[PDB]
From a paper:
In eukaryotes, the ring-shaped hetero-hexameric protein, MCM2-7, represents the core of the replicative helicase. The eukaryotic helicase MCM2-7, is loaded by ORC, Cdc6 and Cdt1 as a double-hexamer onto replication origins. The ORC/Cdc6 complex recruits Cdt1/MCM2-7 to form an ORC/Cdc6/Cdt1/MCM2-7 (OCCM) intermediate. Cryo-EM structures have revealed that double-stranded DNA (dsDNA) becomes inserted into the MCM2-7 ring during OCCM formation, which in turn induces partial ring closure.
In this study, we have utilised the advances in EM data processing technology that have occurred since the publication of our original OCCM structure. By employing signal subtraction and focused 3D classification techniques on the MCM2-7 ring, as outlined in the Methods section and Supplementary Fig. 3, we have identified a conformation characterised by the full closure of the MCM2-7 ring. In the “closed-gate OCCM” complex, Mcm5 interacts directly with Mcm2, eliminating the 10–15 Å; wide gap between Mcm2 and Mcm5 that was previously observed. The structure reveals two important features: First, the C5 is now ordered and visible at the interface between ORC and MCM2-7, implicating the involvement of C5 in the loading process. Second, the ordered DNA density is longer, as it is better stabilised by the closed MCM2-7 ring and can therefore been seen interacting with Mcm2. In the closed-gate OCCM, we can observe a continuous 46 base pair (bp) dsDNA density entering the ORC-Cdc6 complex and emerging at the N-tier ring of MCM2-7. The Orc3-C5 interaction observed in the closed-gate OCCM is sterically hindered in the context of the open-gate OCCM complex, providing a structural explanation as to why C5 can only interact when the gate is fully closed. Since the full MCM2-7 ring closure is dependent on complete DNA insertion and C5 only binds to the closed ring, the structural data suggests that C5 probes for successful DNA insertion and ring closure. The closed-gate OCCM structure suggests that a central section of Orc6 bridges ORC and MCM2-7 through direct contact with the AAA+ domain of Mcm2. In the closed-gate OCCM we observed four ATPγS molecules at the Mcm subunit interfaces of Mcm6/Mcm2, Mcm6/Mcm4, Mcm4/Mcm7, Mcm7/Mcm3, but no ATPγS density at the Mcm3/Mcm5 and Mcm5/Mcm2 interfaces.
Author numbering:
A (entry chain 6): 104 to 199, 259 to 410, 447 to 465, 496 to 601, 604 to 840, 903 to 978
B (entry chain 4): 268 to 469, 492 to 780, 794 to 800
C (entry chain 2): 387 to 442, 449 to 459, 476 to 652, 657 to 706, 737 to 753, 758 to 772
D (entry chain 8): 459 to 472, 480 to 544, 548 to 604
Write the structure that this text describes.
């Protein structure tokens, strides 16, 4: 008898009957492990969930260390002790023949990778997280079989199978000499549903020139049909060694017998906010509270995105709204509305185009970086497996990067057949595959971030956007924004741009001083995606009125626009307004957010040509017009030059001017009001 | 010999504890088996000089990694268990022989043929197979470079990727092969394999290097102290081509190139110099591409129509031993650290010119074909020579109209030289006398030894400066670079980085 | 051995259908035909295979039966007795799309179809109404194709880019187990007596456009490859949706198609994206109203909000089409 | 009433007394800046408690560099902590258990960590002492 094996089984039985987590809402000593057994009797379950963090908090973690080190040796001992606890509480869960109970551990500490799989970790509890590519069907497995002989007629029960059709060599009846004749009894054999899942590396881990490795993960118990292809799941199990049955030198294959699958992409609409707030630390909630209270959060997140690229604040504003996205609403008939925002990067080459695409991939989770220079690498492909022989479905770029941003470079250098599959996934976010007798629909709720090049090198202002790019008409209409970066040779722009490159090459990481760190930005993006803003009644009249004014500029015939305003321009304003309210943690679409999205949409539609910071001049002008116009509505007296500077003294309380910088802002206000006097905006009576 | 070094290093470790008198566990140190990894030997024999008398000999190999195979488990300690009394045993494997027990060790059991081998409870070892390709610098002209199999054990696995120059210095063992998979016969040929002991790239890290000679460093600093360094190196890089002083001055800087200031939170900036030659042909244009390849240890020479968008990237080849889909490097991937010479740049297809847009910007090749979306790194300079359409650069035609190159491709280059073939009586007379002197005497007796540097000394001056000399842009140098960039636009950002 | 697959009307969107193996013994053979809906009432057994354990569910049938209650049959005569029964069905077709009344009349007529009848055992007049959705993209053109797949009894959604020559018609493939030349069905083969949904009809090869025209007249696809000369049937309503829309140019120049292709379609729906301030206000309100509403008291409130937006429910419209078709 | 950052008060559009309030803003250089440094300590003191229960619940003894240990914490907590924040976790744990974690600097800018015996009962008693010192 195993002395060490019996000690673990005795300690495992007491862990499921003495451990209890105190509730914070009621304050009663409720046993989680005892109540889990009673819940398995009603639903008729055969798989338990035991957290690893609870095992380390008992006996100074002496029991969790023996299981995480030698899991295969103590595997029959853990299943034997579990049957004793169930028989004591609810003995009705044994009769179906005895049921086979499996233990599925979740919430594990260390999460190993595929490249870290070595031979020294064979037989230990690990955690491998990867993307699911190919999956097999639901087939049973011969676990505990029963062989009945023909001579002695003895039913040999409890016959384990170690991945091979093993037969008993001797009959329990001593008056028999049979060592070959054995018949399998199906009515007295225990069958289990097993499924092999071929996983791959994560989509966010894109290193240098390497080969993508695959791992055959075997699922057992209630883990069948839990790892869908195209979703990054967190597997948990032991590393088993499966030999070659066809060769029966013995060739071996490294496998991974998993017992629990945790989907990362999956984890009541109100419960989605309490989970993300409780999974973080206590200090993470305090850091998120001070950011929402800040009145200038929309200006700090733009400068924090891509700090190496100087300028281009209009293009950086769309990156923040693209990482959050809109609200994916479903109609009453079953149609799914597109909530993602697709932005295309059009401009002259050598304008920091590769820096913006590399920043999204190396930050946003589940992002695949590809280029335009195949048709199967983007969507999917039907490649037959060399082992099984059947036709399988291989994921591409639009499948592994689900619920993320797909960065595609050189969109104008694409073929005609390769561009047909892209437009198909830009409507219902689905990919229809009909080949080799496989008629299945795969979702593709991704965000395409194209970066094409104009035909001719430089962007011609005398032509339209359609004649300058090498794209079709339906594909160009899918993008909601078109940030045109013009390579203008200016003395003031090139001076400040060259100073940022020299300072970045010298100080390296010392010159980069963003207002928010990389860890703080990832926590605010995932938290803002759970918010669902609702359009109010006052904001509905402002969106329709703003849409009529934009459509009047295209029907007048004077300003020749580069693209005709269709129906998609109206739906693009709704998705852009929802992303702005999400960044401010507001569940109500205020009418002020529509004016911000209207200015960004008008800057992207460039018409076809037939001392003081510019960011501060527009802010000081928009606040001086509504203040004077409010006098005519209310009915006051007048507004002298002294009251003009005094108006901003109470509204700009967060300027942080102290005493030295405070007098500089007062002198700048006199120069701002002086330019409006010379121009045709404001005037002075006396 | 290695087995002796593993025992002498154990006795020396115990002597250091008694001499220091430390309060440490002596049982935990003596039980740890220490291994010695010798490398960098004097016997640097290649794969072609593998004589049959070198059986089980540590020979250093200097090749390149071709492909990579997954880790294969190797059984070391077998695990047995009885089927009657359930008696677990542990029998170690000696020289690949698994001595199975005939009878049970228990007195109550003692049944013959009752022990079951459980492969799930055995201690496996890491074993990786790496296919190494011969270095083209040592392969003679007219022969194809062969390959060899490598065996990596211990914790040195997962340390060599495809397209890396390493130095394997391990033993040269051999294993016999079987003529049939069901019989116990053996063929007359023996499969040769090199057991990898240490991995030195050209886990852990190199502490220092001892290349060249310190006596040659004094001669290097002697030429650096001279003021005529920019003119002496320009003439030694091409003593067979007359004139072209402005063209040779740019190619000299391409071999050196700026430093690579790597950033953690910033993007990678390409420090290579992309030079493009233009003008009329038959002006010693193809001879320049043949001289830089012989100097650079990783330089290649390809043509325009001879290599499409598949030969330059990574063609999906297959192994002739395992019949598996492998990934072989191309002309742009094998040159990781040198200068790529491409002939007839204007005769390339449209599918090939679009791939070079990403190599000249982020130095990365992203291929997404057959469901394999991987990004390959390719940080190397591109030295090509363009040609006009009618093979005659007309002076009354623009540069964009004479050459069929895309406007975005012209802005990605750093130096766009235009070597024209002007008819001059004073130039053709001096050029004919220079070419006639090279054919009269095999050695330039008229030129002094201090005017032309040999090929062996030129390669040692570039490899030494590219590993220790790192210039830093000061405040005085950065001020003139901004003023020069504004004045050029008053007469793209790619010209600033050049 | 018959391989039975799941019905296209029961597979949830975003998943892949499954298939098992059915064994027919005694007189049960030569009953189930490739392209029919049967009810396999057999025993779910299992078999052990030697290749099923080293590389990484047979149902023995007993009775086959080829394929509403009495309360639902009487309700169809009461609704159809009204004078505005035709207008109620058009308004119920695709409730998630506002406007476009001319396009809803073509999809509703293509679901019911005509009455096919042979002419003295010589010619076979088709009855499937072919509708070609044409116009500028953005008017919910692809959303109409997704509505038929969730309402019709047999609808196979296909495309024009992924579906090649064998993606629509049948094919002669080699079995990796029996090493024999089998016959795998395609989009036009697995959609017998149903609706055919093809996306992006303009972005198709020349080898796939000729196979569709050959099935729109004789309703049969004759494929003779690898010595297997078979003449399968294909009777379905092909509802495609291509993309060009210049009003000054005719339909023969705007759409990248031929003359015999456009002649086979019965109804040619043309959508023109016009500028109208009155239509933009009504369309923007329906979008916001359909996104706000996107334990017994909570479930009853969700069903009442969905029935008010459709006004005839969706569950009753599905059984009304199949009742007048057989 | 739990924590819910969702209100309509944000972005609501519309003598020398207020000048004295700007003079008090200079005191934030020693108060607001000091509070920002203490805010990072709250996300490091309680964050290093669960890290010691993650790495030590696995391997031990073998040497581990700073670059290898930083990539294992981020990959195990991505469901986050950045690369710069992971370096301060191992640095703060050395002062708590100097006799259990040995740090040996390498001439070149590399740190290798090594631990022999990691007791959970000893770390639980020392975590409450370090948490109470920062609150005062």
């Amino acid at each position: 008898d195993d002395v060490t094996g019996e000690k673990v089984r005795e300690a495992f039985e007491q862990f499921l009957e003495d451990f209890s987590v105190q509730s914070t809402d009621t304050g009663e000593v409720e046993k989680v492990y005892r109540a889990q057994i009673e819940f398995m009797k009603i639903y008729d379950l055969n798989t338990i969930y035991i957290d690893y963090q609870h095992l380390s908090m008992r006996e100074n973690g002496a029991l969790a260390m023996a299981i995480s080190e030698q899991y295969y040796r103590f595997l029959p001992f853990l299943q034997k002790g579990l049957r004793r606890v169930v028989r004591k509480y609810a003995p009705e869960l044994l009769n179906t023949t005895e049921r086979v109970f499996q233990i599925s551990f979740f919430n594990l500490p260390t999460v190993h990778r595929i490249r870290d799989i070595r031979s020294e970790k064979i037989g230990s509890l690990l955690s491998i997280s990867g993307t699911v590519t190919r999956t097999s069907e639901v087939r049973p497995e011969l676990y505990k079989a029963s062989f009945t002989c023909d001579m002695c007629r003895a039913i040999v029960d409890n016959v384990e199978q170690s991945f091979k059709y093993t037969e008993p060599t001797f009959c329990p009846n001593p008056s028999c000499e049979n060592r070959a004749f054995w018949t399998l009894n199906v009515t007295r054999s225990r069958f289990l549903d097993w499924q092999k899942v071929r996983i791959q590396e994560n989509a966010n881990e894109i290193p240098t020139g390497s080969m993508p490795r695959t791992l055959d993960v075997i699922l057992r118990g209630d883990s069948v049909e839990r790892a869908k292809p195209g979703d990054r799941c967190k597997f948990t199990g032991v590393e088993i060694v499966v030999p070659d049955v066809t060769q029966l030198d013995l060739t071996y294959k490294i496998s991974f017998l998993a017992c629990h699958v945790i989907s990362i992409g999956s984890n009541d609409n109100e419960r989605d906010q309490e989970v993300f707030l409780n999974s973080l630390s206590s200090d993470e909630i305090n850091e998120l509270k001070e950011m929402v209270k800040d009145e200038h959060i929309y200006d700090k997140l733009v400068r924090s995105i891509a700090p190496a690229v100087f300028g281009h604040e209009a293009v950086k504003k769309g990156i923040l709204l693209q990482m959050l996205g809109g609200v994916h609403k479903s109609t009453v008939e079953g149609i799914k509305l597109r909530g993602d925002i697709n932005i295309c990067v059009v401009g002259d080459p050598s304008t920091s185009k590769s820096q913006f695409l590399k920043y999204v991939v190396g930050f946003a989770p589940r992002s695949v970086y590809t280029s335009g220079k195949s048709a199967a690498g983007l969507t999917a492909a039907v490649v037959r497996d060399e082992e099984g022989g059947d036709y399988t479905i291989e994921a591409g770029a639009l499948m592994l990067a689900d619920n993320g941003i797909c960065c595609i470079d050189e969109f104008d250098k694409m073929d005609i057949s390769d561009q047909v599959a892209i437009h198909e996934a830009m409507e219902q976010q689905t990919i229809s595959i009909a080949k080799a007798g496989i008629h299945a629909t795969l979702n593709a709720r991704t965000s395409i971030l194209a970066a094409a090049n104009p035909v001719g090198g430089r962007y011609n202002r005398k032509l339209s956007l359609r004649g300058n790019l090498n794209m079709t008409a339906p594909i160009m209409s899918r993008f909601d924004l078109f940030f045109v970066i013009l390579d203008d040779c200016n003395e003031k722009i090139d001076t400040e741009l060259a100073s940022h490159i020299v300072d970045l090459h010298m100080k390296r990481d010392e010159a980069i001083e963003p207002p928010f760190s990389a860890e703080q930005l990832r926590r605010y993006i995932k938290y803002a995606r759970t918010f669902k803003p609702i359009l109010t009644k006052e904001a509905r009249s402002y969106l329709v009125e703003k849409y009529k004014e934009l459509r009047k500029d295209d029907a007048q015939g004077f300003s020749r626009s580069s693209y005709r305003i269709t129906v998609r321009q109206l739906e693009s304003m709704i998705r852009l307004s929802e992303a702005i309210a999400r960044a401010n943690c507001v569940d109500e679409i205020t009418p002020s957010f529509i004016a911000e999205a209207y200015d960004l949409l008008r800057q992207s539609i460039i018409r076809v040509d037939v001392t003081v910071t510019y960011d501060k001049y527009v802010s000081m002008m928009n606040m001086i017009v509504r203040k004077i116009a409010e006098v005519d509505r209310e009915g006051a007296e007048e507004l002298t030059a002294v009251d003009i500077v005094d108006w901003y003294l109470l509204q700009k309380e967060n300027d942080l001017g102290s005493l030295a910088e405070y007098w500089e802002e007062r002198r700048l206000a006199f120069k701002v009001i002086k330019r409006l006097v010379k121009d045709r905006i404001l005037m002075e009576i006396h | 010999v290695i087995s002796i070094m593993d025992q002498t290093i154990k006795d020396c470790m115990v002597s250091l504890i008694v001499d220091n008198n430390l309060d440490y566990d002596l049982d935990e140190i003596e039980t740890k088996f220490y291994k010695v990894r010798p490398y960098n030997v004097g016997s640097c024999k290649g794969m072609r000089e593998l004589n049959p008398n070198d059986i089980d000999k540590l020979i250093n190999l200097k090749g390149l990694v071709l492909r990579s195979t997954p880790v294969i488990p190797d059984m070391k300690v077998a695990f047995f268990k009885c089927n009657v009394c359930d008696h677990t045993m542990a029998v170690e494997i000696d020289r690949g022989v698994i001595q199975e027990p005939a009878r049970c060790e228990r007195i109550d059991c003692n049944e013959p043929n009752s022990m079951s081998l459980i492969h799930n409870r055995c201690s496996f070892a890491d074993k990786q197979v790496i296919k190494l390709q011969e270095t083209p610098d040592f392969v003679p002209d007219g022969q194809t470079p062969h390959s060899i199999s490598l065996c990596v054990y211990d914790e040195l696995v997962d340390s060599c990727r495809a397209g890396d120059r390493i130095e394997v210095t391990g033993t040269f063992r051999s294993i016999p092969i079987r003529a049939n998979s069901r019989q116990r016969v053996l063929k007359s040929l023996y499969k040769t394999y090199v057991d990898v002991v240490h991995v030195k790239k050209v886990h852990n890290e190199v502490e220092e290097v001892r290349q060249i000679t310190d006596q040659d460093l004094a001669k290097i600093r002697e030429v650096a102290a001279r003021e005529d360094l920019y003119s002496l190196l320009a003439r030694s890089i091409a003593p067979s081509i007359y004139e072209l002083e402005d063209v040779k001055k740019g190619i000299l800087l391409q071999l050196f190139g700026g430093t690579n200031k790597t950033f953690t939170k910033g993007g990678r900036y390409r420090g290579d110099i992309n030079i493009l030659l233009c003008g009329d042909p038959s002006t010693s244009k193809s001879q320049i591409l043949q001289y830089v390849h012989k100097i650079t240890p990783r330089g290649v020479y390809t043509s325009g129509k001879g290599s499409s968008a598949v030969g330059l990237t990574a063609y999906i080849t297959r192994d002739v031993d395992t019949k598996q889909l492998v990934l072989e490097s191309g002309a742009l991937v094998l040159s990781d650290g040198g200068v790529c010479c491409i002939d007839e740049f204007d005769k390339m297809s449209d599918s090939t010119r679009s791939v070079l847009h990403e190599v000249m910007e982020q130095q990365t090749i992203s291929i997404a074909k057959a469901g394999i979306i991987t990004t390959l790194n390719a940080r190397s300079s591109i030295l090509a020579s363009a040609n006009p359409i009618g093979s005659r650069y007309n002076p009354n035609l623009p540069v964009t109209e004479n050459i069929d190159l895309p406007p975005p491709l012209l802005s990605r280059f750093d130096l766009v030289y235009l070597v024209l073939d002007k008819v001059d009586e004073k130039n053709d007379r001096e050029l004919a006398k220079h070419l006639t002197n090279l054919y009269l005497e095999d050695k330039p007796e008229h030129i002094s030894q201090d005017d032309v540097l040999p090929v062996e000394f030129l390669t040692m001056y570039i490899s030494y400066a590219k590993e220790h000399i790192h210039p830093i842009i000061t405040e005085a140098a950065k001020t003139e670079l901004v003023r020069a960039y504004v004045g050029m636009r008053k007469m793209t950002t790619r010209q600033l980085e050049s | 051995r018959v391989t039975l697959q799941e019905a296209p009307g029961t597979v949830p969107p975003g998943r892949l259908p499954r298939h098992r193996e059915v064994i027919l013994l005694a007189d049960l053979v030569d009953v189930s035909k490739p392209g029919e809906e049967v009810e396999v009432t057999g025993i779910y057994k299992n078999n052990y295979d030697g290749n099923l354990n080293a590389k990484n569910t047979i149902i023995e049938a007993n009775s086959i039966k080829r394929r509403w209650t009495e309360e639902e049959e009487r309700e169809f005569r009461k609704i159809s007795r009204d004078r505005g029964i035709i207008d109620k069905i058009i308004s119920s077709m695709a409730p998630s799309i506002y406007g476009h009344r001319d396009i809803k009349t073509a999809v509703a007529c293509s679901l019911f179809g005509g009455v096919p009848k042979n002419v003295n055992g010589k010619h076979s007049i088709r009855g499937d109404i072919n509708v070609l959705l044409l116009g500028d993209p953005g008017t919910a053109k692809s959303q109409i194709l997704k509505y038929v797949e969730k309402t019709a009894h047999r609808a196979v959604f296909a495309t024009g880019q992924g579906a090649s020559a064998v993606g629509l018609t049948a094919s002669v493939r080699k079995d990796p187990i029996t090493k024999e030349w089998t016959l795998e069905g395609g989009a036009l083969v697995l959609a017998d007596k149903g609706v055919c949904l093809i996306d992006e009809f303009d972005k198709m090869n020349d080898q796939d456009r000729t196979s569709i025209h050959e099935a729109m007249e004789q309703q049969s696809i004759s494929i003779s490859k690898a010595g297997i000369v078979t003449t399968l049937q294909a009777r379905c309503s092909i509802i495609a949706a291509a993309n060009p829309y210049n009003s000054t140019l005719p339909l023969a120049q705007n759409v990248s198609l031929t003359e015999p292709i456009l002649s086979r379609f019965d109804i040619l729906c043309v959508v023109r994206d016009l500028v109208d301030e009155e239509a933009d206000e009504r369309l923007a309100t329906f979008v916001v109203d359909s996104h706000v509403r996107s334990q017994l008291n909570a479930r009853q409130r969700r069903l009442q909000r969905q029935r008010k937006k459709e006004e005839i429910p969706q569950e009753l419209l599905m059984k009304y089409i199949h009742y007048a078709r057989t | 009433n739990s924590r819910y950052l969702a209100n309509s008060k944000e972005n609501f559009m519309y003598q020398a007394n207020l000048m004295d309030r700007l003079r008090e803003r200079e005191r934030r250089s020693a108060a607001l800046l000091s509070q920002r440094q203490k805010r990072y300590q709250q996300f490091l003191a309680m964050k290093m408690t669960q890290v010691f229960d993650i790495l030590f619940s696995l391997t031990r003894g073998q040497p581990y560099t700073e670059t290898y240990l930083s990539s294992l914490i981020v990959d195990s907590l991505q469901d986050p902590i950045g690369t710069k924040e992971a370096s301060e976790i191992l640095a703060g744990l050395q002062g708590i258990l100097p006799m259990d974690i040995s740090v040996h600097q390498v001439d070149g800018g590399l740190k290798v960590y090594r631990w022999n015996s990691l007791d959970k009962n000893r770390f639980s008693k020392l975590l409450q002492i370090h948490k109470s010192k920062q609150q005062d």
